[PDB]
Amino acid sequence: AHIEGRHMKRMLINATQQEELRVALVDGQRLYDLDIESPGHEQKKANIYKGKITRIEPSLEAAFVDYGAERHGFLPLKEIAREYFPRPNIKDVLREGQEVIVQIDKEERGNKGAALTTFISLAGSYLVLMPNNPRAGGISRRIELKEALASLELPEGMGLIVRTAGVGKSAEALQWDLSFRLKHWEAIKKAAESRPAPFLIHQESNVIVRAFRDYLRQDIGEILIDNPKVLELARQHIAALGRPDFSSKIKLYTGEIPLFSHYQIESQIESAFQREVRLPSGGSIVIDSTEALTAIDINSARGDIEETAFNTNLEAADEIARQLRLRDLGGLIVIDFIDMTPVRHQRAVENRLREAVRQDRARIQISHISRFGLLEMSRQRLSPSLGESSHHVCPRCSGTGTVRDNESLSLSILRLIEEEALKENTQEVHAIVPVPIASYLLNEKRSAVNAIETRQDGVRCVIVPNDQMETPHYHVLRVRKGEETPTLSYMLPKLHEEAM
Template sequence: MKRILINATQAEELRVAMVNGQRLYDLDIEIPSREQKKSNIYKGKITRIEPSLEAAFVNYGAERHGFLPFKEISKIYFKENARDDNGKLNIKDAIKVDQEIVVQIEKEERGNKGAALTSFISLAGRFLVAMPQNPRAGGVSRRIEGEDRDSVKKVMSEVNMPEGMGVIVRTAGVGRSSEEMQWDLDYLSQVWTAVEKAAAAKKAPFLIYQESNIVIRALRDHYRSDVGEIIIDSPEAYQQAHDFMSMVMPNSLNKLKKFNDKLPLFNRFQIENQIESAFSREVTLPSGGAIVIDHTEALTSIDINSARATKGSDIEDTAKLTNLEAADEIARQLRIRDLGGLIVIDFIDMMQNKNQREVESRLRSAVYDDRARVQIGRISRFGLLEMSRQRLRPSLGESSQIVCPRCSGQGTIRDIESLSLAVLRLLEEESLKDSTGKILAKIPVECATYLLNEKRDKIDGIEQRHNVKVVVIPDPGLETPHYLIERVKEGDTHRHESNYKKSYELTTEDESIDPVELSSRQSTPSEVPAVQHVELPGLKPPSATKKQASKEPGIVRKLISAILGSSESPQENLVEESSGQNRGNRNTSRNRRGRYRGNANRNR
């Protein structure tokens, strides 16, 4: 049975897991102090126009200004007679600095890049996505095919469409009546009306409309008719889900259940270890092989190792079986970790083309249910397969991990001898500069031990050749590969702190020279949106057009039940069904003078 499990017992981290039986197939984690901004609507102000980039930068209230490409600017914001004599449209002629504009975040901030913005607003509902400023856009989701596509088009022909609005039918809209579609569209139209009113009432920049929280998003985006249960372990989150489902999908309320057990929810369904594996670099395959996932600035690389896999009859067969297992696991890990962008997979070499085609086909099948857009290439003669995946939200690593403060994300550091010799060379380099009176080297204890013993004669030679004083300070507050070299001029030596402090008092314990920001995502107070709640007075959600008939248990099940008793799963006794529903249905540097010397890849 498919279930949606919502763990909200820890206020600092809300988790939503989609499971099939006890196998995790999708995961969403939200940290309230770093709420996602994607799909939020803001009123912003254009601060800079860059014709060379064909884009504008918009201040929408964040620390970094957003990036707004020219193609993402609606014509309603263009100046009159913006086209030149040849009929061409230039961004500088179309818009102006300090112009106010309503924008929506299309991509979250990443690293040093600001958020990507668009002025073509889209509002996601249960069955539809409305695009108020884009009447020519719209249609039916690419995932809806065949007869379902034709029936959806027929239903939408009966829906009264607002003027100037485009609509896309989501996969959840399959099998819905025109009344249900109309209700969803009317609600989204009302939201857009509220957004327009709020935008006109206040000067930029400010937040107009905020995307729903993780609980509502999970129900809206992940709930399908094949989901048997929605189990929540927090009273507050349960109430949010109950209110939302009562309004949007009242006929599914019997699937909403409150978890009551001393054992944590995720442990009960044995998925906690699966979540922890998503933070690991290496994931083991059932046959004994493994996939290794590494991240770089340009792409994500995935390597497949056969390791202890010996299932096949020969090398080719073993490689094929391991690659097929890897294809399934890669598709699952992409969803759980929400990896986006360019992904390169290094499959185990296979000599036969038919085996390569089979692996490609398995990967395409495995990503079929992925909500993100996925493009898959073919296995090259080097055994590499390129694919790309749409970034739906910040990846698991970006939202829950920080750059290692020791290696700055590189993964390796220099050894003691290599780093010590590098420091020794820098001491010589600093001593060659004019008017150098003293050089202070604050270095890790291990490096200082090496220099003061194995390389003492080299330090003495630097002092004698250049007539400078070298002070080596073993600093317990520093770890390889971090160090600080400070050059003091001859005229400043009598004023420098090293002149009246002992060398052991010059350590960096109380100085803030941490070379890496421990977290690039600082918590900021949540902004209150201008539009918080939209109601449709007098309009109630229509009941579902089709009710699933309760399945009569087969004769084998009846016999088993008669002999062994009820066949209900043990989890069902640990949850409370939603009140008011049919309870009978159980199936439903700091560098003062000189330079801060350390790792060149340091993030600040």
């Protein structure tokens, strides 16, 4: 019967394992957010570079940047600063080879490079400076502050935003921040004026600093840390981050029972990695990701039908909202709630979902339930998903989740063999295939194979079982007249390795 407010919200930092630093927001024992960092795979979003313009595109109204990755970043027209420009075409604003101050809006995904803007933003605890453009500024829509904002001394060419954490802080306190921002900016444009033009300038902070900078509302009761050395670092991060009011709140955890286990969130953390997640009342949601989009289905538990569909869909809306966050799912998401005949049920389920994602930091947009029962929504990509970052594509099935049955596949291969055997100038065709495929072709289909060889007089069909493949994989190589060897059937895979 979760109600926000009942239990303490806490920040649990588990840092006993070098290879995975974990930060969890927990409410009582209810995990509602997670962040995991490991050496090497450190974050690149909100780094700043000195990049040189590679190639221009009026076609796309943007241009490409060598910021120093093996792959170049993508820089849209709407993102180039009036100050960098000696509605127009991009062919008009920037030159090829031209240096420029660049920030990463979005990490590389799939094939794309990274979206960049020249409109750099510098986040502090209470403020975000946009030294590069005045057009921007204001109050966290989550909120005297109008009154205190006006009083800071911001340089003409720039605007700024008061953060959600500003709520409880005063003017002079914002200025302390506003400045550290300006310092940094000065250092930035200077560490750039003094070089050539492809290098990193500012590395975004690690997962604890980020947590502290971005996740510490007032309603965070305690920050538990399970490792002394790290804890000490944390204290310095808080102070340095201008948040004395949290010092008392940081506490070393010392139980023998590991932190995350003591607060019982380990199974909830694991739920992020599962395809199916049980709901409180017995049903579940099933999350599938596809090329286009993430699809989520909903099943009920095992009694009013109408009431069951409703209560289950409501539970699902809650669970989806957190799975979205834990899994860092982004982009298009399509939800298949159980059918409800009463329209008012449909609105209530939508509203439940709207409510449930209100605390999410990612921008989100939801629509209504379609006449087919689908709800479409979009969530902003804050960082790569669990799938991209802790998984890899199945090596068996190639992401497809299924495997063609042996006979189906065998007959496919058989037809492919015959086609090859028909081509002019063919001397042999070698089919290299999984063991059971070989079995089936050379027993169940021995006649066919025989017929092929007899119709195509003089053509050898060699079909070799290869224990180094499993089914779906195979090769059918064609051997032209004159280029055959006296190689043994079963030493044949190895021969073709230098393909295959």
